[PDB]
């Protein structure tokens, strides 16, 4: 009968204690046996915990907490002594809380958290094996972590009974080591709990609470308030180990569920106004700024780039405060970009992107390059661009985000020679909103769009692509501001689409504007859009002019990514598309020129049209240019592809690079043949001991290194 | 028909922001010939069981019996319920046999010899909760099992004359083809998550089969239209709840009709299948299957050709519905108009699709609308969509959020996440040419089709389309939308709207009369103060608009005063956040007047007064109202002996006389504050006279400038109401209010003949022997005996408009 005499014991410690009766406690020891006696249950530790939670409020109107004896140590040494029932009361604890929060009591809550501060008093209780929780602190903030978000006001009702109880048992002495008593995270979440839910504690700045009227109390919005304002209070949440902080506010605030929170949506929007300004006016060594605005974004910024790595999230967690955050950051965005005194630097909020990046140098083009866009999307048109002032003039021009988009277009892997077009769209539709500030707003433009075409390629090759969903924005910006003509830069555009769109139907003839990369794009891209074969796209074309070959290298690079892209996808060759380039090889053979130095992953020699196109491409294609170069080399005659300048020393170079790939296993046996077949009617570099030294082993450069000496 | 529409309207407006209605209650004493037997039942006819462990609407019916609005006839209520627990309290063998008998007989003899079984499944079907419950899942369930006999020996082109016939027997009866459809909503709708990848392709050939017979259905519980309107509250309330479902069937009502249907010309087969799961599957596919929106590449190597039948022995649901996004019969066959997707039916699907049942994560959520919206925004019009016209846009969006609504939600917080990525770039840019106008005419607009007066009906919808109007405001802000600066060298901050729109349709939004909630009157400080970044001083910009503000809008100020406490540190905040200067002129004068208030009650030291007698009467109203203090604590600190005292005293009859009401409307019969106003009236008595009759006067003649100041900044809900007050607070006083008045008599009669005008009462209506009274003693132009005897009639204006000429 392990039972009946427990409820027996835990009954005659019922009325015992209504009366502090000296001495009256080995009727404790005495459950010991009992306990001894029972050691799947998991009502032991509510029969153990109910005793508490019952004698407590029974005693309570008999005489107040400190004058009530010498209890509750006893009891919970009583309970602790046995390390098997103390890894039991937690877990039941745990999980009432959390999974039933709503359907519990008023007169349970307080029953826990005296108990809890009676544990944080028996620091010596210590065990280590409970999985998942080492020391007793980390139990804490695994349960408090979780009712902060599921359910806000149990947080409350049970971090305010707390501290009323322990206002009244240990305020008796304690002037200075008073703080200790209690756990310190409880003190923390009041700060962040009591303003949020109540307005009238926002921003202002006796013996005792009514002698422990919880058992009998008429609400909880006049006991947080006759305990806020308690000068023995305010001046204790000023020391350090309850000291809350700006970012530990924010990783705090993006965890709430916005469905089971108990706030509408239009007044969880004040409390975020209200309170990021009440961290921007503060001194750093609370943790919040000093006055500035710099320090308000980049610590907005380096909390959504740490909050996102624990919600990888795949395709659920309901919708979280995140968002809510972001558009707190545009409205401060809004307020250093209009302005009297821009003196528009921004080199900050891109360095903190450089470090994310360099952690792990969750890839980068997988969860966080989607974020570096998602925030700067958000933004208004206008950030991207600088807007200096040096005297007034307010010139124009972009340096943070060339140097940057150089860095980021590894992200779209898709196509690989053009950035997505939602990234595409905020910078011309800026360069147009900037304008304005200036005088002559059609005369920068007309500059930076002339800067541009040798700075950051990558963006026009974007527009190009599509040019047919961008130009009606254009136009109806540039005739919604003021009805003038367009500038001389987006209509030279216009002129080479419609000189393509029109000769693609029944055939004209081409103009063939001066830069080619960017006529080859819009004219390959249109012949895809519109399902035309490869055949008109070699016909309507020049003959004569000294632009027409630097046409068709760039068509072929495209071809070539395109191959690829198919490649990472259900991985094959896409027979068709090898034919095309090879159309084009011999439309440009009958000339004397020289295909091959695409295939220099360098920056040696190749003169400046490769530049200007290898600095648009992404570098997870450039790794695979080879897995490209031995499908259409062998499709070619044996000897059209020798009479070049320097050939082999990229064929060799090239399969050096094939191998660090393995470590197509069907292909090596075509890349061991055709690299080792023309190395005899190759170039007059050597006769012989080359093939054989190629057949000996993976020692290509130990040879070569010698050999290309004389060549 | 209608007192129930009425409900429904009440109820939704019961939830968002919900206390308590005001027409219902102004019409319970106005309008109760109506209230009793045409409404009340109407509330009470619902009595089911509280189907629900906890009230969900009996909230309403609790709070209106907390008064004493329901009669004792509440009791019928209950014992009404309980009756309805007493209502509720509570072969097949060789039908499975001869169903199952079919199954042999399609694999190659399906030679019309399929007749003879069908006649005996209808023979013995004839004899027939559990009853419907089983049978169904057993007449349905055979589909999916003679399909599948048959797609063994051959495909579905040359098979296939019997389903039609099978469901022409089925349709062939009438309370059975009404189950079928029940038990499919239910087994797609609760067990569809988890139910079987073969029982669904038995459903996509159930509802095409039961599109070429066009049978009739006009009695059903809900629907009673053809089936038109049965497909889409099925696959609106699936792709609501279930995606993944939605699209793994209309990609298989669609490859069952490419196969079959198929050899006949192009012109009539697009009349087969319906034209919703097209309209849908231009939808859904470009969300959840990326690769396929416009970005990566148009792959085609089997473009002309009829797919194959392969949902039986397949791979997977990313090549049944891609090897068919690519069919060029289809590609090119979403053009038509029968079935186009446009930017206002996009909205209605993805502005109703609740997270927690999505299957993206937030930051793809977040990547497909971007997408959308950047590609209905350079799309032709005669095609759904808008050029590159920014405005038609975001007029679009607020369109589609008004009409949603006929708290907390989660798909149309990403919407109004979108208005304010669009703004941004406009707010910017200073069009000065298309400004703010554009935008509040759609309010306008929506706003003047309920001006039809009628049965407590166009009220709720009204105020509850107000309300969201509001809601938007709070949910595009950069927070300085609403200000309108210029440009000619320097910048005037000046905002020529926002000002139209409060003093004509706002103000009359919320609670406590003449004031606005404190969630919109902190957005136009916190936007002058974000927007007096851009000016040269940055402190004479404030005080421009602040000192411009008294004379327009001034409905905002007094919004101020009464949440002034809530409103202090915020400012004085965001100041110092960005600045971080001294404060200005004119937003400190408030502070001073706020502590003088409390420093002078507290001991009593004769207030001052800042010549400005609607402000300071505002601060002292609110400062006591809350603070539960009386009245002789109240007036008992003026210092009026020359200076403007009478108007410091008619502002609080005013302010009096206006919260007689907010206690009323809400749940009340009467307030006893009217004291206070007979005591405001006998201390206007003592000084040279100081008339108190502007207020209850509604035109514009003589009305001086305050009495003009007020009315502009109360509602019209309550200025419809004031005779009741007139005519509670009068009886209390006599032989002082005429014949030392200016212009009684006139004021009178001209609201007699609004509280006439008001219904279609002992405490209610009185004044009849009242104003029966005044007469016999008033100050005489004629008045003899006539207007004792005409007034005593139903026409007070026979004889008045002449009695008052010879004056």
Same mark, same amino acid.
């Given at each position: ?72 140590? /006893? ?126 504690? +926002? ?105 996102? =790595? ?17 558009? +707190? ?81 590894? =992200? ?84 080479? @689409? ?5 000769? /693609? ?94 295939? @220099? ?21 450039? =790794? ?51 690299? +080792? ?12 001991? =080359? ?21």
């Amino acid at each position: 009968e392990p039972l009946g005499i427990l409820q027996s014991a835990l009954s005659d410690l019922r009325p015992l204690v209504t009366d502090a009766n000296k001495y009256e406690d080995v009727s404790a020891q005495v459950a010991v046996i009992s306990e001894k006696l029972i050691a799947q249950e998991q009502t032991v530790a509510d029969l153990l915990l109910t005793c508490f939670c019952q004698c407590l409020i029974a005693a309570s109107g008999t005489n107040p907490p400190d004058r009530q004896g010498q209890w509750p140590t /006893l009891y919970v040494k009583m309970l602790c002594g046995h390390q098997w029932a103390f890894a039991a009361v937690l877990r039941r604890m745990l999980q009432l809380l959390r999974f039933q929060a709503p359907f519990l009591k008023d007169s349970h809550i307080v029953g826990l958290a005296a108990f809890s501060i009676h544990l944080h008093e028996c620091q010596p209780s210590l065990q280590f094996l409970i999985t998942g929780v080492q020391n007793l602190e980390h139990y804490w903030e695994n349960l408090l972590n979780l009712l902060c978000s599921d359910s806000v006001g149990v947080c409350l009702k049970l971090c305010t009974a707390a501290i009323s109880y322990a206002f009244c048992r240990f305020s008796e002495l304690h002037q200075d080591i008073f703080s200790g008593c209690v756990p310190p995270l409880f003190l923390r979440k009041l700060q962040y709990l009591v303003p949020r839910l109540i307005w009238e504690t +926002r921003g202002e700045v006796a013996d005792s609470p009514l002698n422990w009227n919880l058992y009998a109390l008429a609400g909880w919005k006049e006991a947080a308030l006759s305990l806020w304002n308690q000068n023995r209070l305010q001046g204790l949440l000023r020391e350090k180990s309850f000291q809350v902080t700006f970012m530990d506010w924010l990783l705090w605030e993006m965890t709430l569920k916005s469905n089971n929170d108990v706030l509408c949506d239009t007044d969880r929007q004040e409390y975020q106004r209200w309170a990021v300004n009440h961290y921007l006016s503060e001194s750093s060594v609370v943790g919040g700024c000093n006055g500035d605005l710099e320090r308000g974004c980049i610590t907005i910024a380096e909390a959504v780039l740490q909050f996102s =790595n624990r919600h990888i999230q795949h395709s659920l967690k309901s919708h979280t405060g995140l968002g809510d955050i972001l558009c +707190r950051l545009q409205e401060l965005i809004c307020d250093i970009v209009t302005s009297h005194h821009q003196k528009g630097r921004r080199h900050f909020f891109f360095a903190i992107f450089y470090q994310r990046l360099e952690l792990h140098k969750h890839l980068s083009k997988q969860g966080v390059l989607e974020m570096c866009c998602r925030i700067l999307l958000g933004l208004p048109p206008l950030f991207l661009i600088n807007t200096p002032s040096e005297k007034g003039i307010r010139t124009l021009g972009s340096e943070d985000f060339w140097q940057f988009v150089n860095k980021e277009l590894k =992200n779209l892997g898709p196509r690989g020679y053009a950035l997505p077009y939602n990234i595409t769209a905020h910078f011309f539709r800026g360069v147009i909103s900037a304008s304005v500030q200036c005088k002559d707003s059609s005369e920068a433009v007309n500059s930076i769009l002339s800067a541009t075409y040798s700075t950051c390629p990558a963006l026009l090759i974007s527009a190009a692509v599509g040019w047919p969903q961008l130009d009606p924005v254009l136009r109806s910006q540039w005739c919604s501001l003021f009805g003038v003509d367009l500038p001389k830069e987006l209509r030279t555009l216009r002129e080479q @689409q419609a000189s393509v769109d029109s000769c /693609l139907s029944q055939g004209e003839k081409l103009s063939l504007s001066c830069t080619p990369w960017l006529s080859a794009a819009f004219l390959y891209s249109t012949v895809q859009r519109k399902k035309l074969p490869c055949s008109r796209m070699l016909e309507i074309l020049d003959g004569l002019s000294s632009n027409f070959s630097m046409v068709l290298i760039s068509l072929l690079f495209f071809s070539v990514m395109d191959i690829i892209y198919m490649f990472l996808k259900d991985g094959r060759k896409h027979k068709d598309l090898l034919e095309n380039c090879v159309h084009i090889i011999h439309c440009l053979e009958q000339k004397g020129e020289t295909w091959v130095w695409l295939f @220099q992953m360098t920056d040696e020699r190749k003169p400046e049209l490769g530049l200007h196109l290898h600095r648009a491409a992404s570098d997870v294609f450039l =790794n695979l240019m080879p897995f490209a170069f031995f499908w259409l080399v062998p499709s070619l005659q044996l000897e059209q592809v020798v009479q070049q300048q320097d050939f082999l020393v990229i064929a060799l170079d090239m399969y050096h690079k094939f191998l660090q790939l393995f470590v197509h296993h069907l292909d090596s046996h075509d890349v061991f043949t055709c690299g +080792r077949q023309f190395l005899l009617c190759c170039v007059p570099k050597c006769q012989k001991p =080359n093939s054989a030294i190629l057949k000996k082993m993976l020692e290509s450069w130990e040879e070569h290194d010698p050999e290309l000496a004389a060549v």
